[PDB]
Amino acid sequence: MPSIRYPSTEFPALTGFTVPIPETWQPDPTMGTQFAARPHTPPQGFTPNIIGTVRRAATGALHNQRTELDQRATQLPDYAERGRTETTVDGFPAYHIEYAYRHHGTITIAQMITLVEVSHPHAVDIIQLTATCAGDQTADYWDTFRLMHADLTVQPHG
Amino acid sequence: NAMPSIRYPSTEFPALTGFTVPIPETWQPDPTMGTQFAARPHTPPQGFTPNIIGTVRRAATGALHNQRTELDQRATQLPDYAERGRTETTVDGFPAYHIEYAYRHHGTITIAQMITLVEVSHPHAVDIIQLTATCAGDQTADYWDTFRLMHADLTVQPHG
Numbered sequence A: 001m002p003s004i005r006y007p008s009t010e011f012p013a014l015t016g017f018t019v020p021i022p023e024t025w026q027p028d029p030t031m032g033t034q035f036a037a038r039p040h041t042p043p044q045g046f047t048p049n050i051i052g053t054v055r056r057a058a059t060g061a062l063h064n065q066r067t068e069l070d071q072r073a074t075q076l077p078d079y080a081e082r083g084r085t086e087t088t089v090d091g092f093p094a095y096h097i098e099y100a101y102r103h104h105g106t107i108t109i110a111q112m113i114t115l116v117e118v119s120h121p122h123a124v125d126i127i128q129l130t131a132t133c134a135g136d137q138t139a140d141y142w143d144t145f146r147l148m149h150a151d152l153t154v155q156p157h158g
Numbered sequence B: 001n002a003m004p005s006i007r008y009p010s011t012e013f014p015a016l017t018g019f020t021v022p023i024p025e026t027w028q029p030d031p032t033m034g035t036q037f038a039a040r041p042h043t044p045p046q047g048f049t050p051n052i053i054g055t056v057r058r059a060a061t062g063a064l065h066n067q068r069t070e071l072d073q074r075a076t077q078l079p080d081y082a083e084r085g086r087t088e089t090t091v092d093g094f095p096a097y098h099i100e101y102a103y104r105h106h107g108t109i110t111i112a113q114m115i116t117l118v119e120v121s122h123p124h125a126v127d128i129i130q131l132t133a134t135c136a137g138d139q140t141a142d143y144w145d146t147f148r149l150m151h152a153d154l155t156v157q158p159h160g
């Protein structure tokens, strides 16, 4: 049996990425994601957070994930979208979406997502950055979230 | 107004563990599948194409146990679920889990799957390496031993 090792030239390592965080926040290495941060002084109730995850996916993944986000939208109660954009993050194709919905009739969840697609020869990486807070926390956090997403960078050569 | 940056990978958010799978000379890697590892036969049976895929992901402490629970729940649901066996195990010394099962897909084909999970611990989190081989029910006589050999010879390449 030939031995197929990951990473290799034809199954490359995952793209790196960087997120700036403000003084009021701190990284959370226990979250279980490749990037996470939380306020050092969290409010009562919902704990706002931001996470980042990079994964290998097939060519066309950014379009497929956008469809999945569309489809998920139809199944979030009281879905309210602020906006969606097609953009670039370091020149790499990206998608950004901001919305809120009502979860179990019990809390309002507001989320800000950026997806970035880095292309390899045979496949892609999708970087997903997701910031979440409660609906009555958006006045406290939305500008901070926007800055973190705006200054997301990707490092495809390490 | 000057925000520091948090870079992945780093000591606190480390890179993913590598892994290696041997494949028969009658199989070939498939870099287009969209996974960190994939392979398929050069000449497959008709209908379903047998394949093996490998993924490694970052997860929280306790993820292997959690995934075992999530697989158990996914099961009580899958039509005509049939389990060959399950067990805790180790792979290159690391905690691991193995399960083999089949179920009915679309009422038209039986899908047989062999899964090995390996949990590599980092200081604050873990990696889960998941190896999944799949063929159709009428293909197990031709493929199950080949699957066993690939799962038996999975190795892990941690980095300090």
Ligand SMILES: [Mg+2]
Residues within 6 Å of the ligand: A086
């Ligand atoms: Mg478009």
Ligand SMILES: [Mg+2]
Residues within 6 Å of the ligand: A090, A154
């Ligand atoms: Mg660049």
